[PDB]
Every structure is written in C-alpha cells, then in structure tokens.
Enzyme design. Structure first.
Site, PDB file in Angstrom:
ATOM      1  CG  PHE A 209      43.093  36.281  43.636  1.00  0.00           C
ATOM      2  CD1 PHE A 209      42.591  36.923  44.493  1.00  0.00           C
ATOM      3  CD2 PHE A 209      42.999  36.634  42.414  1.00  0.00           C
ATOM      4  CE1 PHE A 209      41.821  37.941  44.438  1.00  0.00           C
ATOM      5  CE2 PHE A 209      42.185  37.818  42.062  1.00  0.00           C
ATOM      6  CZ  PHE A 209      41.672  38.480  43.115  1.00  0.00           C
ATOM      7  CG  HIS A 212      41.570  37.872  38.172  1.00  0.00           C
ATOM      8  ND1 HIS A 212      42.493  36.898  38.771  1.00  0.00           N
ATOM      9  CD2 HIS A 212      42.431  38.815  37.890  1.00  0.00           C
ATOM     10  CE1 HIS A 212      43.684  37.240  38.947  1.00  0.00           C
ATOM     11  NE2 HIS A 212      43.959  38.345  38.102  1.00  0.00           N
ATOM     12  CG  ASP A 214      45.182  41.500  35.668  1.00  0.00           C
ATOM     13  OD1 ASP A 214      44.567  40.613  36.439  1.00  0.00           O
ATOM     14  OD2 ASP A 214      46.458  41.554  35.514  1.00  0.00           O
ATOM     15  CG  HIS A 268      45.537  35.792  35.195  1.00  0.00           C
ATOM     16  ND1 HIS A 268      44.984  36.795  34.428  1.00  0.00           N
ATOM     17  CD2 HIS A 268      46.078  36.388  36.111  1.00  0.00           C
ATOM     18  CE1 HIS A 268      45.040  37.784  34.983  1.00  0.00           C
ATOM     19  NE2 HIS A 268      45.607  37.754  36.097  1.00  0.00           N
TER      20      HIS A 268
HETATM   21  C1  LIG Z   1      49.759  37.908  40.548  1.00  0.00           C
HETATM   22  C2  LIG Z   1      49.226  39.066  41.001  1.00  0.00           C
HETATM   23  C3  LIG Z   1      49.149  40.183  40.170  1.00  0.00           C
HETATM   24  C4  LIG Z   1      48.244  39.177  42.170  1.00  0.00           C
HETATM   25  N1  LIG Z   1      46.682  39.277  41.800  1.00  0.00           N
HETATM   26  C5  LIG Z   1      45.959  40.006  42.982  1.00  0.00           C
HETATM   27  O1  LIG Z   1      46.090  40.011  43.962  1.00  0.00           O
HETATM   28  C6  LIG Z   1      44.757  40.643  42.163  1.00  0.00           C
HETATM   29  C7  LIG Z   1      44.470  40.281  40.727  1.00  0.00           C
HETATM   30  S1  LIG Z   1      45.715  40.699  39.601  1.00  0.00           S
HETATM   31  N2  LIG Z   1      44.927  42.132  42.111  1.00  0.00           N
HETATM   32  C8  LIG Z   1      43.954  42.863  42.897  1.00  0.00           C
HETATM   33  O2  LIG Z   1      43.431  42.555  43.785  1.00  0.00           O
HETATM   34  C9  LIG Z   1      43.964  44.275  42.128  1.00  0.00           C
HETATM   35  C10 LIG Z   1      44.562  45.422  43.155  1.00  0.00           C
HETATM   36  C11 LIG Z   1      44.402  46.901  42.631  1.00  0.00           C
HETATM   37  C12 LIG Z   1      44.985  47.816  43.707  1.00  0.00           C
HETATM   38  N3  LIG Z   1      44.473  47.310  45.009  1.00  0.00           N
HETATM   39  C13 LIG Z   1      44.534  49.203  43.219  1.00  0.00           C
HETATM   40  O3  LIG Z   1      43.741  50.116  44.130  1.00  0.00           O
HETATM   41  O4  LIG Z   1      44.843  49.691  42.196  1.00  0.00           O
HETATM   42  C14 LIG Z   1      48.380  38.089  43.157  1.00  0.00           C
HETATM   43  O5  LIG Z   1      49.429  37.801  43.360  1.00  0.00           O
HETATM   44  O6  LIG Z   1      47.575  37.651  43.779  1.00  0.00           O
HETATM   45 FE   LIG Z   2      45.868  39.351  37.680  1.00  0.00          FE
END
Ligand SMILES: C=C(C)[C@@H](NC(=O)[C@H](CS)NC(=O)CCC[C@H](N)C(=O)O)C(=O)O
Ligand SMILES: [Fe+2]
Length: 329
Positions: A209, A212, A214, A268
């Site tokens: 990933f 980005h 958050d 990150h």
């Molecule tokens: C470590 C993390 C927190 C994760 N990241 C993601 O998968 C990403 C970026 S933090 N997260 C999203 O795609 C946001 C999801 C929002 C969710 N689907 C909703 O509707 O609230 C990961 O492990 O990939």
């Molecule tokens: Fe994140």
C-alpha cells in the site's frame, strides 16, 4: 538500510482514571510523539488483543468464497448498492492479495435517524451467518466498544496535549453517532507471490500500500508482530517497529486540519511482506455534523486561517480520494 523511527511506548492507563496530574504527564508524551514522527505505541491499554487476533483469525480462515460474495461491498457486488463502506473487500488472486471485512457503529440499525435518512457514510453492518461463525458478531461488536473506550481515553490525552479541556474531542465522539470503523485486514502468505500484487515505491521499496495520510481524527491500530510500516520523516522513510501487544497510534488529516498542522498527519506506507498476518485498524471518526473550530497552538492568539469543516464533509470526501489515489482495497 532504513533507520528505525522513534516510536515511543506510552503508558496510557492514567487516561482511564482521575489523577489529573498523571494525565498531564501522559499528554506531554503524546504531544512530543505527535510533534516528532507522529506515531507512538499505547501500552497498558486494557484491551485483550490476543483474543482479538484469535477471533479474527478464526473468521478469516473459515469464511468461504460463497460468503464473501454474499457480504461484499458494492465495488465487488453490484447487487449491494447500499454497501459502500461496510462488508467484505475481496482479494483478486494473482492481482490483489489483501482482503478485509469492515464494520461500522453497531448502533447504526435500521431505525437509526441517519440510516432512515440515507445520510452518506452511514450504513447498517452486514454479518456472516451465526451458525457458520458462532460468536463472531457478538465478539466484533464488543470489540468496537472496547476500542471505542480506548479511543475516548486517547482523545482526552490529545485534548490535554493541545491545551484544551479533556472532553474537547471526546464530546463529539459518541456511541450513538460515531462514524468510526473497524477493518479486519488479512494479508496472506502466497507462494509464489504474484508480482501484480506488489507495488514498487520510487525508492525501490516493495509495497502492499502506497504512501498516504489517514482519513481519520486518529487511527488506533493492532497489527501482528511482523514489521511492515514505514513513516516519512526529514531523514527519509523510517521503519516502525512491530509490537503486537501495544496499539500503534497516529493522527489523521482531520487532526492536522484542526491544529493547523501542529500535529501533522504522518505520511506512511505499508511494505510488502510475504507473511500471513493481520492489520486491524480502528479509524476514530466523529459524528456527521461534528464541527470543531480550527485553532493553532503555535500562535499566540490561538487563531487559525482554516475554515471549519464538518466531519461528515471531511469523511465523505476523504474516503473517495484515498480510493482514487491508492486503489480500491
Ligand atoms: C495499517 C493499516 C491501518 C492499513 N491501511 C489500509 O488498508 C488503508 C490506509 S490506513 N485503509 C483504508 O483503506 C481506509 C479504510 C476506511 C474503511 N474501509 C471505512 O469505510 O471506514 C493496512 O494495513 O494496509
Ligand atoms: Fe494509514
């Protein structure tokens, strides 16, 4: 190699009690971490993360393809037009390795006023069949409230850290209306691991990933004990150490907006690792109409030249933008 990021361990247990001075000493630690790399580990948090991991593993390893379609969000199943956020996010074998299950506030029931109105970002959770996954829905709903409780405590520490009263954020973080989400992400071990499912950073780092910030006020994350996250700093991308007894905490872009970047949303990214692991974030979102006036803790008069932004406006715009930038998860 990349250097190790400074990610301090902060004992947050005072934030659950009534020793105001001790809470201030926690707040200072949060302030320092938020001004540095933007990440810290919350320890002494009171949540049973091993049980979380066990229950999540039992779910991920037992759910079938049939059930995944039947729970799928709209991006994977056109029949489910109401499921934008909540439901199953399928892997695409050979192309997209990760899969996940998202759920929202358990109080978003069919009679909830925001559900009746069909307000954006509110949905009723979908769940697998109880006989196939005994206890899972009950466990998952209770986990939502356990991590809500930790998040409320953390928000009291961020408020104190910014010079505010301890309910400054928490008064907008309510069981009846929070837009917060849990995501139960499965990263698989695959042999061979398809290249199409591995992204490559400009510096050559293999990623799952891309970079980005958050979409959250704060993010409260439990992950397996497998190193994978990196944070951009002045000194380049640095590795965030693993610690699967603590919760990894960082600010999202709504906090950056409210604080005029005093507490930045750290950039990150997630490294590619060929390991069967879990990533279980709780995105701490406020209510749809929550608006906090932006301020600036580095300015004498505290004023900011940012305009107020309702949380619902922020969230609806952010979730779309993140998908466009980094792809549908
Ligand atoms: C470590 C993390 C927190 C994760 N990241 C993601 O998968 C990403 C970026 S933090 N997260 C999203 O795609 C946001 C999801 C929002 C969710 N689907 C909703 O509707 O609230 C990961 O492990 O990939
Ligand atoms: Fe994140």
């Amino acid at each position: 190699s990349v250097s190790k990021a400074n990610v301090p361990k902060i004992d947050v247990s005072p934030l659950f009690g009534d020793d105001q001075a001790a809470k201030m000493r926690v707040a200072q630690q949060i302030d320092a971490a938020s001004r540095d790399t933007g990440f810290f580990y919350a320890v002494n948090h009171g949540i049973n993360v091993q049980r979380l991991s066990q229950k999540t593993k039992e779910f991920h390893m037992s759910i079938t393809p049939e059930e995944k379609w039947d729970l799928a969000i709209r991006a994977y199943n056109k029949e489910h037009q109401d499921q934008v956020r909540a439901g199953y996010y399928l892997s695409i074998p050979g192309k997209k390795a990760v899969e996940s299950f998202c759920y929202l506030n358990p109080n978003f029931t069919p009679d909830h006023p925001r559900i009746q109105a069909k307000t954006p970002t509110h949905e009723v959770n979908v769940w697998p069949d109880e006989t196939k996954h005994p206890g899972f829905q009950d466990f998952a709903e209770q986990y939502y409230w356990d991590v809500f409780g930790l998040s409320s405590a953390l928000l009291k520490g961020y408020a104190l850290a910014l010079g505010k009263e301890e309910n400054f954020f928490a008064r907008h973080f309510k069981p009846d209306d929070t837009l917060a989400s849990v995501v139960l992400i499965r990263y698989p071990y695959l042999d061979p691991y398809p290249e199409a499912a591995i992204k490559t950073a400009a510096d050559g780092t293999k990623l799952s990933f891309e970079w980005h910030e958050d979409v959250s006020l704060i993010t409260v994350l439990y992950q397996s004990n497998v190193q994978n996250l990196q944070v951009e700093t002045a000194a380049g991308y640095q590795d965030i150490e693993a610690d699967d007894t603590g919760y990894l905490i960082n600010c999202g872009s709504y906090m950056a907006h409210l604080t005029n970047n005093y507490y930045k949303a750290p950039i990150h990214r997630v490294k590619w690792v060929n390991a069967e692991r879990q990533s279980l974030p709780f995105f701490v979102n406020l209510g749809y109409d929550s608006v906090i006036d932006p301020f600036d803790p580095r300015e004498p008069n505290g004023k900011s030249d940012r305009e107020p932004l309702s949380y619902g406006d922020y969230l609806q715009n952010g979730l779309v933008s993140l998908i466009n930038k980094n792809g549908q998860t």
